[PDB]
């Protein structure tokens, strides 16, 4: 089921230098909560400044949903350390409040008023918030409080040399392989096998607290439960075809969306009634990206310069790390992305891509189940999970040797050894571990307990890269960037919307 | 997709006498049922004697589950006639009971009520029954009532010869492992043609099933649900990581499985309130418990295990277990089928088979699954292992049959006549018209009268045939003698035991 | 044979402050006996209250098997005093019952029906008792009545700091460091039973060796029979493929073992006529059934197992479990032992320790075995792993002690005083003269009066000492408060049980 | 437990050609028996000629105990085929008789009258026979009918040359003595894998013996009872450190009295019983699991030959008869020994005393009586049992496999590596071993039953098979030549046996 990559691997083993210069970036989300596990209703904390302009710290869908962001980085440890500074600072400057360590919220009722992300009075800020309002009215607020971790990754220019359009075509290859084989991610690092009742077909088992869980599950975050664009026939074979599918989607009405309406008593309800308001409304486990310019849309930018990097978006929050992501995970994704770039990927239609989901779903709902088998696309399940994983890891291990040879030491290889172990025993995986803790204490209990311990820890730890003064400065500067946008003579919102993306 | 077998074929055409003396054998399973289609709850018919020792007629899982076995035989007609005599005698000696003519039984409400095969109070008889008790407890009784046909096959020595010392047993072995590998690759042609289980009763339960008010589930283009995951409870040899490249490897993998404890079956416990529930708590209680569509074999010497015997003498012959019951024959198997299998097996021995890893083998299965579930689907395409599907089924079968026809020409020239050739012409037509296959035929019947109605009717018709037909090879007096003799042997084993079953058991589990 | 640890000692002597703030803990076990040495068959003393939940006093495998436990502590005298209090208080609240002075029981028969530790009706409490049921059925009750002392030990943050350990790094460098410690404990930790081993002899009712008879079995030159194959029944971690090179490997190996079905234990069956016999039939029922003379630890959150905790947070502290009961102290452990252990652990952290395969670990045991059965033997030599024995034991200990002395100079300079150094001078003498060790001493006594006789005598003397002594840290009221807090924490859990035992048992076994 | 041989192995991989030209030989014993299994009482078959002087076919203790011998050989396949031609020819020329396929006899009665091997009127021949008479009277006849396989092994010169005239000649004896010390330590691995006598007929009988209804004794987890106290002196003090010490200890053994053997007498009723009353009648009465050797001339004792030329080759004698081969041995075995013997020559072995040697036996006994027993542990010498058997085996096979890589690189192909993969699997699973396999068959149909059946199939197999290397002509030629040699020796014989014996006893 794993394809034959023997040829491309040998090539790589003979061009090791061609991997030197990997660029990475992390994004990690977390809910601000009270000590009692309730959703914080205070505003974005003072010391962090302007969520709308800050370079490193901002908000996602909700006002209480922190989003931490690292600068693009060449060094793993540096980047994780940077990310940890952000957390250190924030944990110290947010009152008696703390950071929720899990993907899944707990203490949140059904229909609970969730303050949307607040970006001020500028056009840009209003738009951002409106997009959110939009999302609230189409999909519900609740599911939007589910947090995750995003990983940015680019291969060095050297890699494509050794072997623009060649580049974009290469990243499309990567994405296609991610669709076929990336269920490996929730298997290993998936960390949401349970969900609060408040949050609701499946064989769910219920506890006395009213915790719902699937015995063998991995990542309910990624399930239909946690996350409608199936009539879009978006494809990943080719730059122009992808973009074209993306654009036509922007211009694709919706019956469901025309209903909500744009307005009611003057309140704008959404940006538009199109299936996609903006392009990023598009569901994407993995996403082709190019840094955009000003007034330039993601598709414009892609079209212009081709694919620059990719964004992996399938990771749940790592509960066992205070920054919600660790070295082991980062290193695994390096290995995996590279492999995805080496492996041979036939072109896939729309419906063929949708078919690659069946394996994802199986892994998501029951990945840790003994005897579990996977299948090729929609076809009958045939292949035992553990053997597939071992096959995959034989290859990754080879990638790892190469990578360890250029970087020096054996860090990647050790990581392969460590995770391969998880195929012979699923009880080693994140989901099994966190599930054991959740059955005894519940989601809430586990959440508060971790959140508290992490709070103490992070609070008492020194700043390493970002000093206190760097934060104070960026606060001040971000507040000011926002005020400058606010005070500017911007255009009428209407025609403005009209001239966007 | 069919490989190139030109030389092996030209080689064969020049060495025709290399195929002379093919040895074959048949086994056929069937449920003893009442007129209403339900399992007979009576004991093994007394006229059939001891199921434990009987030469031709025994039982499988269930007490009601008959197993017919023919002696190894070089003549096809004689073998089929022999099998039929077994059915004829049985048919007239089971009171008002009859035989279920389908692989898939009719609605069963209470699986756990199904009387296990009974073998008396001898230690060996009790071991055999306990083995089944274990199967019941591990996998459920219900699915063990699903039935099929087994075809045993050996090439003549002259075949190997035309193709020294300690190397002979080894070369023969490697030849048979090649056959097996090829079966895994191309063997799906078997359920395509002769598959006869497109439907299943809901009592026996993700898939696009059509449903009926009575609870008959089916798939429109399916061939053999019996071979699907829904049709067997066991662990496929292919899934356990057992491979077919090398004799020693294969044997080791198998014995490893006999020896490996199971968390799952330990949880059942080896006991519960003085009732022994299993033989042991290992993956495989014994070697037979392994699910094998195709199995290497060598006749055992007393006390020796099947894998022991393989290791000792290498591979002697092959057992093809993948045939559904043929509903269009009273004996559940026909001449056209046996002849096809002769052709295909021979071809599997000529065709070149690269060695395969666990996961490579698993890939050969992708095509099997397609054929099993939607084999009759217009426009169906097959692939090379896991690789993208691109080869239209009808063309692939025509290509295989051009080779099979050459094999047929050769066998036809040594036996005299045109029988094998005719068979190729009859069967190849099924690739252009899939409504000619067994599965399409039986599905039509089933949609009209159900599994139950279709089965009750054929069972009745076949009972009436088999009740009236005179015995051809065996005569009444032979069944009577074998009754006496078989009872006698069971009696002797019972008396000859010197130890408590618990003591004897500790020593053989 | 002792490594060159120069560089690291030098370093240490320059960073004395780095050793400040060592945390410790003790656990001691003792059988409640009657005056006549027989096993007390009453129940956990009222005054002590709830064994299941009590913060300081509890039970081990038997209802009569007392287990005393001190809070984590940075101060040696305080910790020991605390433990002494528990004993004092207990020894006056248990009738004419007294505490067995030794590791090795006596007056306990091979078939004796020993009452299992009783922890109530709650689910948690019931599981606890069943764990024990299973221990009995698998290994035998008697063996589990052997008693010992556990020493917990963590280095201060300052130590690691002084020795880049920030953010995430810390957790790993500390873990690594403690694995270095364990490895070195396997190589060099035989020094412990040499010095402190106190079971030269064993009762008839318990038992290959050159044993000598009296009804008492003894070895002339033996140290700790309790650490021998005749002393613990379990499966040594060293034996199960478990290694100490790396946090993840270690945990993986441990987790593998609790998931490993055992043929042997499956036969015990898991239910024996309504009576549940074990939690399950796996090699290890729960992770703590693993035989571990030195054990890596992290404080467990509810819902999490020892391995989960380790995986999450890394190694926090070490548990040393190979100490026999010190006969010469009424609390079974003394200040000289505790101080030696600090010294030895510290040195174990400094000394370089190559990584070790599980077969190289097995090799380290050769020396242990020699010491355990003949450590006090004149002319006894030790080897580098499995390699030829060539290093006289006394010289090896002297060499080790020249290092431990330097380490003591350092701890003494920080605490103020000479206590550690004194301990080194006293103990090193045991290498020139083995008759100074605990084993020689207690052996002389056991030969004269027997195990039985020796035990009774010391038990009655110590009982009298402790029944007379004032409490010092704990007031009679602190104890009385805990019967309550304890006896109620238990009820609370007994009302919280929604789900029955079988349904809950099944999320956990 | 398994030493560190990393450096020697690394050395080996750098110098692959050091193993090119390994030399070997096989010997194989088997009883002539009827279809009912009873002992054949006819004489040494006629197409085979003179047992006394034949080059390839001969007799051991009993006249019915055949002994097959191959010429020294460099090619594995060729040597096996050769041994096989011998069996084929014989199988067709022994009438209705056939060859007992196991080490352990069954149809032989306790205190039975077995015809001693007969070698004719010659001084020499009468001596050979008298020796056996001696063994009969000393140890009992029955035990001498237990059969086995011997393997000869020598390293090529190129091996020694690359490890380093006559400065070389002492370097070799030391190398083989090392091989032998290591064999004593780790060689129990042989009966573990290939031992095939877990059972013994009651005729041959304080052990935990289990017993069937046929009257067949067995141990559950046993491997090779032939090697045990029941299947075949420890005061001799023979060591393997040095060539002189060894030869001295051995000559001293022959000059050494035995009050047990003095009681037998040297003669009763004109009937000579032994050669003498000494602890060993001759040097080769010495019990030896493994034996250092040099090709003896004529008039040379084995000790003399050694003393003179040094150790030329090694003789491995602990092999049970392989029941699953018509010739009682197979390629897989032969290859394993190549590996092991080579490994034995690479691994450091300290010098050993008598009592240290005796201690190596503790493990041997464990493996022999219960080597298939789960959780079985082994120890260094007499020391505490500590090391799980499976893992010891695997450690060993880790090294054997590196050796195998090397040998496969020069011979071409992957045959040696494959053998490693197969045999190591016997460590995870004893039920793959010979003894486990044979035991299942024996429990069901007895030693007797299993034997007769295997013999019968092998007879038929072999009778039908064509000669491949030897031709009949060759066998008929060797028959004549072997006949003259006996005649020429019976002719040119000076004095009456009564006095020739006067210098050789």
Curated annotation (Swiss-Prot), chain C:
One of its GO terms (molecular function) is metal ion binding. It is an enzyme of class 6 (ligase). The keyword ATP-binding applies. GO terms for biological process: cellular response to arsenic-containing substance; cellular response to mercury ion; glutathione biosynthetic process; hyperosmotic response. Pathway: Sulfur metabolism; glutathione biosynthesis; glutathione from L-cysteine and L-glutamate: step 1/2. Its EC number is 6.3.2.2. It catalyses: L-cysteine + L-glutamate + ATP = gamma-L-glutamyl-L-cysteine + ADP + phosphate + H(+). Pfam families: Glu_cys_ligase. The keyword ATP-binding applies. GO terms for cellular component: cytosol. It comes from the Bacteria. Keywords: ATP-binding, Glutathione biosynthesis, Ligase, Nucleotide-binding. PANTHER family: GLUTAMATE--CYSTEINE LIGASE (PTHR38761:SF1). Belongs to the glutamate--cysteine ligase type 1 family. Type 1 subfamily. This is Glutamate--cysteine ligase. The gene is gshA.
From Swiss-Prot, chain D:
Its EC number is 6.3.2.2. Keywords: ATP-binding, Glutathione biosynthesis, Ligase, Nucleotide-binding. Pfam families: Glu_cys_ligase. It comes from the Bacteria. Pathway: Sulfur metabolism; glutathione biosynthesis; glutathione from L-cysteine and L-glutamate: step 1/2. Belongs to the glutamate--cysteine ligase type 1 family. Type 1 subfamily. This is Glutamate--cysteine ligase. It comes from Escherichia coli (strain K12). The lineage of its organism: Bacteria, Pseudomonadati, Pseudomonadota, Gammaproteobacteria, Enterobacterales.
């Amino acid at each position: 089921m794993i394809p034959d990559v023997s040829q491309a691997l040998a090539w790589l083993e003979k061009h090791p230098q061609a991997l030197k210069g990997i660029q990475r970036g992390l994004e990690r989300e977390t809910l601000r909560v009270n000590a009692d596990g309730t959703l914080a209703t205070t505003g974005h904390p003072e010391a962090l400044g302007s969520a709308l302009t800050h370079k490193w710290i901002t908000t996602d869908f909700a006002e209480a949903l922190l989003e931490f962001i690292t600068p693009v980085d060449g060094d793993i440890e540096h980047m994780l350390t940077f990310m940890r500074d952000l957390h250190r600072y924030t944990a110290r400057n947010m009152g008696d409040e703390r950071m929720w360590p899990l993907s899944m919220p707990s203490y949140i009722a059904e229909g609970q008023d969730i303050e949307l992300a607040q970006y001020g009075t500028s056009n840009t800020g209003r738009f951002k918030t409106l997009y959110r309002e939009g999302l609230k009215n189409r999909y519900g607020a609740l599911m939007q409080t589910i947090s995750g971790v995003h990983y940015n990754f680019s291969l060095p220019m050297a890699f494509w040399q050794a072997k623009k359009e060649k580049i974009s075509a290469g990243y499309f290859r990567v994405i296609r392989n991610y669709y076929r084989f990336g269920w490996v991610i929730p298997y290993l690092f998936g960390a949401s096998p349970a969900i609060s009742s408040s949050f609701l077909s499946l064989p769910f088992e219920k506890t006395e607290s009213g915790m719902y869980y699937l015995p063998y599950a991995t990542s309910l975050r990624l399930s239909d439960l946690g996350y409608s664009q199936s009539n879009l026939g978006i494809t990943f074979n080719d730059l122009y075809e992808y973009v074209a599918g993306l654009k036509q989607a922007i211009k694709t009405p919706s019956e469901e969306y025309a209903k909500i309406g744009i307005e009611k008593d003057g309140k704008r309800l959404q940006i538009n009634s199109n299936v996609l308001q903006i392009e990023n409304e598009l569901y994407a486990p993995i996403r082709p990206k190019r840094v955009t310019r000003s007034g330039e849309s993601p598709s414009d930018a892609l079209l212009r310069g081709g694919i620059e990097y990719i964004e992996v978006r399938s990771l749940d929050i790592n509960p066992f790390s205070p920054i919600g992501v660790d070295e082991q995970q980062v290193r695994f994704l390096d290995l995996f992305m590279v492999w995805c770039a080496l492996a041979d990927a036939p072109e896939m239609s729309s419906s063929e891509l949708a078919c690659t989901r069946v394996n994802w779903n199986r892994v998501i709902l029951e990945g840790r189940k003994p005897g579990l088998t996977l299948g090729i696309g929609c076809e009958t399940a045939q292949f035992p999970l553990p053997q597939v994983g071992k096959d995959l890891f034989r290859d990754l291990k080879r990638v790892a040797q190469t990578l360890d040879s250029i970087n020096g030491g054996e860090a990647y290889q050790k990581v392969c050894d460590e995770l391969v172990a998880c195929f012979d025993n699923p009880d080693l995986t994140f989901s099994a571990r966190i599930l054991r803790s959740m059955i005894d204490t519940g989601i809430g209990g586990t959440g508060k307990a971790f959140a508290e311990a992490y709070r103490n820890l992070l609070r008492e730890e020194p700043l390493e890269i970002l000093r206190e003064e760097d934060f104070v400065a960026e606060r001040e500067a971000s507040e000011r960037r926002q005020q400058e946008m606010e005070a500017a003579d911007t255009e009428p919102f209407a025609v403005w919307l009209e001239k966007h993306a």
